[PDB]
Design a binder for this molecule. Structure first.
Ligand SMILES: *[C@@H]1O[C@H](CO[C@@H]2O[C@@H](C)[C@@H](O)[C@@H](O)[C@@H]2O)[C@@H](O[C@@H]2O[C@H](CO)[C@@H](O)[C@H](O)[C@H]2NC(C)=O)[C@H](O)[C@H]1NC(C)=O
Lengths: 194, 64
């Protein structure tokens, strides 16, 4: 019984960052050597654990949070970071344990005329709690006069799109990001290395 | 590039509203966002570029 990493890393479609998709992995064999040595990943940053020791650990749970973000925003997917993604779309806790994996997906998520199906939240009343999914579309209240659900002066639809076209420079390329959050609490430890 | 420029515009807006210690700053930044949003939808490159230039000057002043 192998873990469904092929349903996470090789997914036909990734979720938008404002509404990231959490896939729960349990009761299976998790081979992490294929992910570390794939050599197709530009980012592989682990917190609380060394990448090369993953196969020696067993976990209560593994959660794969998958989404698409812009190249320059990859640096925000880390504990202790700030910015529009870290604050309003995907917040990792300061004591986060897990691995952040990302790769350039320009040949998958970018159409000739531009792929505009990926949304992110630009406006929010306050910062997110760790792993909170705010998928509300309520019009953002910027001014002192109530918006009442309608866009206009100091009233905004909170979500913006990413214009991912194939001619963009590196910082404007799409990246597919998978964050593997690890629970190492006392447990049956149902998912682990071979 | 128009899409890169829009994405730049939103980055400048986020940071501008992060360091917007005064309420007047926020008002100006929101105004600029609205203008940029309209320019983007109507494919007006020059107008969108102008807002971005204004946002950069605004943010540089806040940061320095
Ligand atoms: C993610 O998928 C890649 C490749 O896609 C698979 O293989 C293709 C040939 C095709 O059949 C696709 O529909 C499949 O989804 C996997 O890379 C392969 O890994 C094997 C085992 O090491 C290797 O022999 C192949 O040569 C590799 N092929 C390529 C193109 O790289 C990759 O391992 C998958 N990752 C996960 C987590 O499932």
């Amino acid at each position: 019984n192998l873990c469904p990493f092929g349903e996470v890393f090789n997914a036909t479609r990734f979720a938008s960052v404002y509404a990231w998709n959490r896939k729960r992995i349990s009761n299976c064999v998790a081979d992490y050597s294929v992910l570390y040595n794939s050599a197709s990943f530009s980012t592989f940053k682990c917190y609380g654990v060394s990448p090369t020791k993953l196969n020696d650990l067993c976990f209560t749970n593994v959660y794969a949070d998958s989404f698409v973000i812009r190249g320059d925003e990859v640096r925000q997917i880390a504990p202790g970071q700030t910015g529009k993604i870290a604050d309003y779309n995907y917040k990792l806790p300061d004591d986060f344990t897990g691995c952040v994996i990302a790769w350039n997906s320009n040949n998958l998520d970018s159409k000739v005329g531009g792929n505009y199906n990926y949304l992110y939240r630009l406006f929010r009343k306050s910062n997110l709690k760790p792993f909170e999914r705010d998928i509300s579309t309520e019009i953002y209240q910027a001014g002192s006069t109530p918006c009442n659900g309608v866009e206009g002066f100091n009233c905004y639809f909170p979500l913006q799109s990413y214009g991912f076209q194939p001619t963009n420079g590196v910082g404007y390329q799409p990246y597919r990001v998978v964050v593997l959050s690890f629970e190492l609490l006392h447990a049956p430890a149902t998912v682990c290395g071979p | 590039n128009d899409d890169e420029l829009h994405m730049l515009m939103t980055d400048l807006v986020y940071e501008a509203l992060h360091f917007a210690k005064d309420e007047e700053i926020k008002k100006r930044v929101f105004q600029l966002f609205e203008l940029a949003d309209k320019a983007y939808k109507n494919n007006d490159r020059q107008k969108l570029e102008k807002v971005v230039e204004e946002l950069k000057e605004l943010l540089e002043r806040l940061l320095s």
